Amino acid sequence: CALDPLSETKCTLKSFTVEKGIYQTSNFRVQPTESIVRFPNITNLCPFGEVFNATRFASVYAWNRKRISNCVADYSVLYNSASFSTFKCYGVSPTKLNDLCFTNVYADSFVIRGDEVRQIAPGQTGKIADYNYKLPDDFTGCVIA
Amino acid sequence: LVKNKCVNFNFNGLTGTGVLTESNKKFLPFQQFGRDIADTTDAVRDPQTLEILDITPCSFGGVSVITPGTNTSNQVAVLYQDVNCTEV
Amino acid sequence: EVQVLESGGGLVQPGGSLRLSCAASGFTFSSYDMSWVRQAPGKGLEWVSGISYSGGSTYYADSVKGRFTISRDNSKNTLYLQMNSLRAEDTAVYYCARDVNFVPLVTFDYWGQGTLVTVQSVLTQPPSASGTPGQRVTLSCTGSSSNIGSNSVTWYQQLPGTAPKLLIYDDNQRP
Amino acid sequence: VNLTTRTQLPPAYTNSFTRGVYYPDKVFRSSVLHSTQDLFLPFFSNVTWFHFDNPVLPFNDGVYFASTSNIIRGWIFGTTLDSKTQSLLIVNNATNVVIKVCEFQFCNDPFLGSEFRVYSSANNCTFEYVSQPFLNFKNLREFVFKNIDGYFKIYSKHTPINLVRDLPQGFSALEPLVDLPIGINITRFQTLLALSSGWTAGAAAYYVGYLQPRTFLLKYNENGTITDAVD
Ligand SMILES: *[C@@H]1O[C@H](CO)[C@@H](O)[C@H](O)[C@H]1NC(C)=O
Ligand SMILES: *[C@@H]1O[C@H](CO)[C@@H](O)[C@H](O)[C@H]1NC(C)=O
Ligand SMILES: *[C@@H]1O[C@H](CO)[C@@H](O)[C@H](O)[C@H]1NC(C)=O
Ligand SMILES: *[C@@H]1O[C@H](CO)[C@@H](O)[C@H](O)[C@H]1NC(C)=O
Ligand SMILES: *[C@@H]1O[C@H](CO)[C@@H](O)[C@H](O)[C@H]1NC(C)=O
Numbered sequence: 076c077a078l079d080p081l082s083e084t085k086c087t088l089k090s091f092t093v094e095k096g097i098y099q100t101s102n103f104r105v106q107p108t109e110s111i112v113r114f115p116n117i118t119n120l121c122p123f124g125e126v127f128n129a130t131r132f133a134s135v136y137a138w139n140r141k142r143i144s145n146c147v148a149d150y151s152v153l154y155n156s157a158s159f160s161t162f163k164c165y166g167v168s169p170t171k172l173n174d175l176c177f178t179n180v181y182a183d184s185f186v187i188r189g190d191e192v193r194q195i196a197p198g199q200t201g202k203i204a205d206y207n208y209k210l211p212d213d214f215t216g217c218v219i220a
Numbered sequence: 221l222v223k224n225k226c227v228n229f230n231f232n233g234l235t236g237t238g239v240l241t242e243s244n245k246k247f248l249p250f251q252q253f254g255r256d257i258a259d260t261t262d263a264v265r266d267p268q269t270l271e272i273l274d275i276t277p278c279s280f281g282g283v284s285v286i287t288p289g290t291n292t293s294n295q296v297a298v299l300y301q302d303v304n305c306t307e308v
Numbered sequence: 309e310v311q312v313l314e315s316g317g318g319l320v321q322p323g324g325s326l327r328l329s330c331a332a333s334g335f336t337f338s339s340y341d342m343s344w345v346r347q348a349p350g351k352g353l354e355w356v357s358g359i360s361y362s363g364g365s366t367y368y369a370d371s372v373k374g375r376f377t378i379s380r381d382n383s384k385n386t387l388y389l390q391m392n393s394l395r396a397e398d399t400a401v402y403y404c405a406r407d408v409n410f411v412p413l414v415t416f417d418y419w420g421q422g423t424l425v426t427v428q429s430v431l432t433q434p435p436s437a438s439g440t441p442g443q444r445v446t447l448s449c450t451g452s453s454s455n456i457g458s459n460s461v462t463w464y465q466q467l468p469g470t471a472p473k474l475l476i477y478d479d480n481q482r483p
Numbered sequence: 484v485n486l487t488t489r490t491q492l493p494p495a496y497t498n499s500f501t502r503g504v505y506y507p508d509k510v511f512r513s514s515v516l517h518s519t520q521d522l523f524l525p526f527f528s529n530v531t532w533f534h535f536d537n538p539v540l541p542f543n544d545g546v547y548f549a550s551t552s553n554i555i556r557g558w559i560f561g562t563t564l565d566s567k568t569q570s571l572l573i574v575n576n577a578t579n580v581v582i583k584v585c586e587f588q589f590c591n592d593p594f595l596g597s598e599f600r601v602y603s604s605a606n607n608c609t610f611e612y613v614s615q616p617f618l619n620f621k622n623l624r625e626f627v628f629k630n631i632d633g634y635f636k637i638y639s640k641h642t643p644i645n646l647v648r649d650l651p652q653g654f655s656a657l658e659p660l661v662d663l664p665i666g667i668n669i670t671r672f673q674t675l676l677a678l679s680s681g682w683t684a685g686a687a688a689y690y691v692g693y694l695q696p697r698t699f700l701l702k703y704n705e706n707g708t709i710t711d712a713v714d
Contacts, residue, residue: 104280
């Protein structure tokens with residue numbers, strides 16, 4: 076039941092002799108040649124520079140916190156930026172960051188010591204994590220140093 | 221954007237299979253979908269360039285076979301119902 | 309568990325090719341830099357190459373520069389070393405080491421079990437040092453202003469026949 | 484403390500004949516009679532006729548607004564306010580509507596004159612928009628405010644009219660104007676008016692109708708605009 080149009084008739088009628096007439100053997104449908112995912116051109120890019128490219132950061136004890144919403148943010152540009160030496164994402168994966176949506180983002184900006192950057196991971200202890208800026212172990216975010 | 225091809229379009233959250241053709245439907249400046257009495261998506265506004273496209277379901281239908289008696293002859297003609305001549 | 313399995317090691321011939329693949333689970337593999345490190349049978353560790361969190365920046369040892377390609381597929385969270393135009397000096401055991409921190413303060417904490425591939429050191433650390441129980445032994449690394457002075461010094465203790473283990477990172481701390 | 488001029492005035496009522504119909508969705512329909520169940524203003528309903536008078540009003544299931552020299556500037560949607568809870572405040576001083584769901588400190592007296600003293604300051608803002616201006620009597624501006632799924636959507640239409648009292652006859656569908664992902668609950672609101680104690684007032688009437696889960700039948704014409712409706 077796959078080589079001849081006649082054979083499909085023999086197969087639908089379940090007979091080896093097909094009487095004269097017209098027989099609706101099967102159905103066809105032109106298949107999607109491809110997929111066209113289309114969205115409106117980006118209109119509300121987020122200003123990461125306001126927090127990242129800021130000319131004056133804040134002390135770690137008085138760390139700045141900037142709310143990000145009413146906006147679209149491309150975290151792939153940050154992740155694929157050579158300026159950042161550390162991009163540690165906890166609770167999420169950076170490759171899927173553009174895939175997900177959140178109610179709001181908080182950019183917590185401060186300045187610490189190099190030996191001290193490893194204190195901005197969930198569950199870490201010391202003098203920055205315990206005393207200056209603590210991240211919960213149930214952390215859904217990223218750290219960019 | 222590709223027109224005149226059966227595609228799996230995903231205009232915003234609205235997904236569907238069909239062929240996209242430029243049209244003259246005058247969507248109001250706020251309208252995105254188009255619909256008919258059957259409550260089926262008929263037209264869509266292209267999100268990133270403000271244009272109106274109709275979603276014609278891709279050529280589909282029954283495949284009837286016209287055959288004389290098998291004892292008479294083995295020759296066969298094929299009738300693709302309600303479809304233009306596309307693939308032979 | 310932050311274990312990193314690794315495979316792709318076996319008998320090959322000089323001038324050929326070999327794909328080593330190590331899969332990391334238990335952590336965000338796409339956020340931590342990783343590297344391939346090499347240990348010749350009965351010889352000190354030789355760091356093959358290293359790839360960043362994004363896979364954009366790749367670093368290679370000049371002994372293997374221009375013939376090994378380090379690659380990283382974050383979707384399957386696996387990481388590959390493509391060894392091409394191999395030499396006789398490359399017969400060793402390979403590990404892929406997770407990098408705790410950014411470069412330059414590299415810190416290799418978790419290491420693969422070891423893939424046996426069959427086909428000079430900048431830091432003039434002493435060949436050996438003899439100690440006694442209850443003694444206070446100081447085994448001293450040595451480097452230039454680019455090796456020791458500017459970047460963190462990390463100490464690994466490799467037991468006989470096992471993967472290395474981090475002891476000291478950032479010049480002072482312990483895991 | 485409120486304005487020094489709070490004369491007693493009963494909440495006069497009028498009849499919204501066919502007003503309050505808005506495109507329930509962004510769908511285009513041509514020569515179609517669509518029967519949708521949604522929150523509309525009932526036909527021939529008793530809508531309150533406020534006239535300088537803006538007493539607080541409930542926002543139970545979204546409310547229709549009918550405003551007939553740009554005297555109204557916006558509205559103050561709140562639940563507890565008093566710097567206790569965030570609230571929606573819209574201000575159109577001069578062709579400049581601004582949307583702020585902030586922890587405002589608005590004093591019950593939205594003093595204004597140009598002079599602005601509606602709220603001392605806004606802190607803890609979550610959404611800020613600077614979109615293009617949304618806004619006998621000459622212009623009638625009808626609005627519909629609604630809260631579905633946290634989303635706050637404003638349908639609106641500005642119509643050149645000739646009238647002095649009540650709402651004009653005829654039919655005009657309220658085109659969607661802007662949707663705000665506020666995501667917060669709201670139950671009460673206010674209004675904002677241009678008119679430091681002996682301040683006069685200007686001629687301005689605004690009518691408040693209340694949306695209800697009604698079933699309507701919209702007559703989309705050939706061009707897709709809703710030309711007629713029967714509830
Ligand atoms: C900061 O400035 C640099 C200048 O090259 C630019 O490339 C980068 O995108 C900026 N980053 C942000 C977050 O604005
Ligand atoms: C959106 O981008 C497209 C492609 O560049 C352009 O043709 C169109 O004019 C843009 N429209 C807007 C919303 O600016
Ligand atoms: C509205 O209520 C007032 C006061 O009871 C009444 O006089 C008027 O007839 C009512 N109008 C409508 C539209 O029902
Ligand atoms: C700010 O407003 C938000 C609105 O949801 C509220 O939850 C929060 O408690 C307020 N306080 C601060 C300072 O965020
Ligand atoms: C649609 O708009 C056209 C002008 O473009 C107008 O002539 C026509 O009357 C409108 N629709 C109706 C009511 O037929």
